Amino acid sequence: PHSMRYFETAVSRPGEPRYISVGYVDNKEFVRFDSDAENPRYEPRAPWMEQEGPEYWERETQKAKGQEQWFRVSLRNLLGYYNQSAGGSHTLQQMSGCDLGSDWRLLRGYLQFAYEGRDYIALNEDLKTWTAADMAAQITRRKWEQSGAAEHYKAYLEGECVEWLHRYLKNGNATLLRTDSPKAHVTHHPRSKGEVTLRCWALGFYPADITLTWMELVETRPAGDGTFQKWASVVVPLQNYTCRVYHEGLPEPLTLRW
């Protein structure tokens, strides 16, 4: 199971909007564009991404410069719809990409927009129809049905998205396919009532997907070195509980106790 994603944000300044685009391959950041930079360019964010030549980066940079301008004009159109004025502080975001099955064929294509942090318009799983989140997005919806915008994104999602994700997955087998198993241990913290907090730690694992079972469960966090951390905890009296850790890099799922 594989995926490519591009996450785009344009934020308005009081009194030119900043545009940031971030590319992901299997949930790992691999390219990034920032308009605030001295010389705005798509930059490699993974070591295996330095394969590509100067023409690749230039082509991607220019496409980012087009998105930035697209995001400006859309921001102006949004102000007209929601009856706001120019110019305050606003946020426009977009998610796009394709999911691949193990057979390397298209599972699902994505295209969705958000204004002010909440849903605006999404392309449906069929890649033909649009679902609008509110009244203003309905104007966009009917405008995009008449001009047939759905077909253009359908072509990307079934074409370039899939075919380039294949290229990226080839170029980074030693890191995208590579696994790091969670080294797990359990800690003991006596509490009020005769109760103890048994806390199961999973540290230094890649990728981020994991399941902890025995109920406080913190959200998965980056270690900062490329690996991830997570823990789960239960309240126990005076220790026949077992923590179970399920992860791709584990031949057998780990079972541990205090």
Binding site: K63, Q67, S74, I121, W164
Partner: peptide
């Protein structure tokens, strides 16, 4: 490979 949007919002 990034996307190029068509019609604006």
């Amino acid at each position: 490979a990034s996307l190029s949007n068509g019609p604006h919002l």
